[PDB]
Amino acid sequence: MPGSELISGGWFREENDQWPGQAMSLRVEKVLYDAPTKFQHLTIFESDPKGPWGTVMALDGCIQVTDYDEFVYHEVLGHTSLCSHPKPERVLIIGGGDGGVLREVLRHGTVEHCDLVDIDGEVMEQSKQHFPQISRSLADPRATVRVGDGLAFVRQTPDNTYDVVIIDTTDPAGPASKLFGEAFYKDVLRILKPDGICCNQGESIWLDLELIEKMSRFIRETGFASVQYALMHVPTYPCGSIGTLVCSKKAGVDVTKPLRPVEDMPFAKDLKYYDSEMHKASFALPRFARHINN
Amino acid sequence: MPGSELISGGWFREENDQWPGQAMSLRVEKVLYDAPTKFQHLTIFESDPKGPWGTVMALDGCIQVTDYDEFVYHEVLGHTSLCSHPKPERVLIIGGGDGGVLREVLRHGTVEHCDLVDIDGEVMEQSKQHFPQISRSLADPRATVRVGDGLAFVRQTPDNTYDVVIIDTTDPAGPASKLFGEAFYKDVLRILKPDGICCNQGESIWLDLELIEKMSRFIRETGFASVQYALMHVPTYPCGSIGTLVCSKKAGVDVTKPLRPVEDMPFAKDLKYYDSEMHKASFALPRFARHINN
Numbered sequence: 050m051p052g053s054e055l056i057s058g059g060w061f062r063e064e065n066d067q068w069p070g071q072a073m074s075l076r077v078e079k080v081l082y083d084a085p086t087k088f089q090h091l092t093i094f095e096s097d098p099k100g101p102w103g104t105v106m107a108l109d110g111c112i113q114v115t116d117y118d119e120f121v122y123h124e125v126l127g128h129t130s131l132c133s134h135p136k137p138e139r140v141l142i143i144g145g146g147d148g149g150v151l152r153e154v155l156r157h158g159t160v161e162h163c164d165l166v167d168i169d170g171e172v173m174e175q176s177k178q179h180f181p182q183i184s185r186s187l188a189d190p191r192a193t194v195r196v197g198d199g200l201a202f203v204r205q206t207p208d209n210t211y212d213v214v215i216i217d218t219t220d221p222a223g224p225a226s227k228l229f230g231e232a233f234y235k236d237v238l239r240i241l242k243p244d245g246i247c248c249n250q251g252e253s254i255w256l257d258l259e260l261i262e263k264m265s266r267f268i269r270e271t272g273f274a275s276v277q278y279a280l281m282h283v284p285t286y287p288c289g290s291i292g293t294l295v296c297s298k299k300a301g302v303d304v305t306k307p308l309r310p311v312e313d314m315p316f317a318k319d320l321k322y323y324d325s326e327m328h329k330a331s332f333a334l335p336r337f338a339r340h341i342n343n
Numbered sequence: 344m345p346g347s348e349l350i351s352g353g354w355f356r357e358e359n360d361q362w363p364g365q366a367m368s369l370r371v372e373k374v375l376y377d378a379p380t381k382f383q384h385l386t387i388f389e390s391d392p393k394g395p396w397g398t399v400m401a402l403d404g405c406i407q408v409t410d411y412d413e414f415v416y417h418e419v420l421g422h423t424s425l426c427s428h429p430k431p432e433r434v435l436i437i438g439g440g441d442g443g444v445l446r447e448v449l450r451h452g453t454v455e456h457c458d459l460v461d462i463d464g465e466v467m468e469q470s471k472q473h474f475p476q477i478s479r480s481l482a483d484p485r486a487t488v489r490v491g492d493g494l495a496f497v498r499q500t501p502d503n504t505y506d507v508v509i510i511d512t513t514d515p516a517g518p519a520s521k522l523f524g525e526a527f528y529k530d531v532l533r534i535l536k537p538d539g540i541c542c543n544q545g546e547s548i549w550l551d552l553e554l555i556e557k558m559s560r561f562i563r564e565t566g567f568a569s570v571q572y573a574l575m576h577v578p579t580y581p582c583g584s585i586g587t588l589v590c591s592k593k594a595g596v597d598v599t600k601p602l603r604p605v606e607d608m609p610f611a612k613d614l615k616y617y618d619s620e621m622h623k624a625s626f627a628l629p630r631f632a633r634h635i636n637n
């Protein structure tokens with residue numbers, strides 16, 4: 050479990066045994082906050098003003114968000130799931146304490162309410178202080194923001210409660226561990242309504258392709274009718290990309306083409322990454338990973 | 344600018360003023376070569392065998408190739424350009440002294456001859472010694488390999504010589520400098536046959552978007568009828584991606600949909616990244632960059 054010692058000689062170095070032998074490094078202008086939380090080690094620094102990255106957040110030594118590229122993952126998770134759903138009115142976010150996916154969910158006019166549950170209340174608090182453009186969602190009249198374990202939350206929730214569940218979690222080492230398990234997905238399937246859509250933080254085709262194969266297999270077997278992995282460019286996640294498994298409870302749904310294209314909604318031109326062309330492209334995978342989606 | 348000092352404390356750190364404030368880092372197991380060439384600083388190392396990267400080559404401190412992900416860029420440049428041409432028989436490769444694009448170009452049955460011209464004979468020599476799976480192509484009877492400057496080579500070539508020109512260069516700092524220039528593209532246009540295609544090493548949408556905008560405009564200005572940027576995933580290039588400008592001399596050519604799909608050719612199944620679905624997907628650009636193609 051990495052902590053403060055990743056910042057050394059003016060650089061943050063993302064050394065981790067979850068990706069042995071490589072580390073993304075960012076020069077540190079100023080550390081804004083660095084402390085153990087009740088659950089994780091949280092570090093926030095201002096990176097070199099000569100580069101574009103701005104403020105950076107890491108949890109247990111893993112880069113979470115930067116000012117410069119945070120729009121990609123937030124938009125892809127928010128809009129790829131909601132544009133796959135016929136009328137998403139009630140949405141649950143597990144994790145996502147920075148507010149980024151919530152910001153994108155609330156651009157949707159169909160959404161009446163979004164619950165957000167993150168185990169670590171300090172992520173919400175520091176995101177409010179140091180990433181106001183990411184966390185201003187947390188104060189929305191349509192949001193509830195709860196501190197708690199996501200596994201316990203879904204287990205306490207009634208059948209058929211949500212239209213969309215978005216699992217925006219840290220990596221499997223640390224308190225997100227069980228959120229990558231089959232028993233959790235089974236409960237996710239149960240709290241979804243019949244036309245339910247679920248997407249997650251689905252890890253890397255370069256480093257975690259075997260995990261991605263495992264998850265897509267067991268999520269289909271637990272009872273989701275379809276699962277398709279969407280690939281996105283994020284320079285500051287390990288190896289420059291991350292994906293999301295986009296899962297439909299209802300059979301005969303094609304999540305790879307937008308059901309409700311964002312281009313018909315008034316906020317499409319505000320987005321910096323996602324549009325319907327990017328939605329469709331994100332499901333095309335390099336030949337070596339294409340078996341995930343075939 | 345950078346040399347041997349990029350290896351320190353068991354690690355290679357890709358620090359460079361072309362991407363200020365950031366660096367990919369790789370643990371070094373054994374240094375295999377590290378010395379100035381006639382033109383540039385060449386570093387070759389075996390990376391951590393606990394990680395997946397294998398052998399790594401850097402020029403002037405910029406990572407050029409690793410065993411693990413070299414297939415992406417070489418497949419994309421070789422096949423996106425050739426599959427856009429009705430019958431590519433003569434091909435020129437500028438740069439490319441590692442052999443990788445050449446390996447891909449020679450899979451095509453239509454190719455009768457390929458000239459490859461790279462300024463650095465030592466790159467070719469070290470590629471044969473440390474990267475035999477990349478450099479096997481250099482001895483092919485269908486290739487003529489030259490050590491020389493690409494600028495002078497194209498200036499000395501007759502009009503209408505080549506079906507395809509591929510410009511596989513290092514970054515603009517160092518001997519590739521003028522290969523990013525409008526004078527060079529004028530000559531490239533002149534040496535293409537009337538249905539000629541050109542593609543290049545087109546840099547990063549995250550770090551070099553203004554350069555990509557300028558190049559795209561001047562290449563159209565010099566008389567290419569169209570220019571489209573294809574985006575690809577390469578973990579070990581800065582920000583984890585790179586692109587290629589795919590340029591048609593003839594009007595009426597849509598390079599973004601394959602003219603000669605690879606799936607109809609006998610080697611398609613041998614590829615590890617590229618296929619027609621990936622080709623089409625490569626031209627969908629995040630909103631913030633999409634003005635390049637639209």
Ligand SMILES: C[S@@H](CCCN)C[C@H]1O[C@@H](n2cnc3c(N)ncnc32)[C@H](O)[C@@H]1O
Pocket residue numbers: 108113114122143144145146147149150166167168169172197198199200217218219223224225226228
């Ligand atoms: C910051 S968010 C990812 C950054 C891009 N939005 C990842 C969050 O997952 C939370 N997380 C990790 N484990 C859990 C559990 N078990 N429950 C809820 N939230 C969790 C963790 O506190 C981070 O804030």
Ligand SMILES: C[S@@H](CCCN)C[C@H]1O[C@@H](n2cnc3c(N)ncnc32)[C@H](O)[C@@H]1O
Pocket residue numbers: 402407408416437438439440441443444460461462463466491492493494511512513517518519520522
């Ligand atoms: C290694 S190759 C890129 C690695 C992915 N194939 C880049 C080559 O560009 C050559 N290069 C740089 N400048 C020139 C000029 N001016 N002419 C030809 N080749 C050049 C340089 O020697 C590298 O071998």
Ligand SMILES: C[C@H]1CC[C@H](N)CC1
Pocket residue numbers: 111112113217218219220250252286287291
């Ligand atoms: C959102 C989550 C942050 C941690 C990364 N390693 C993977 C993606």
Ligand SMILES: C[C@H]1CC[C@H](N)CC1
Pocket residue numbers: 405406407511512513514544546580581585
């Ligand atoms: C091929 C070329 C090598 C150096 C990188 N910065 C860009 C891509």
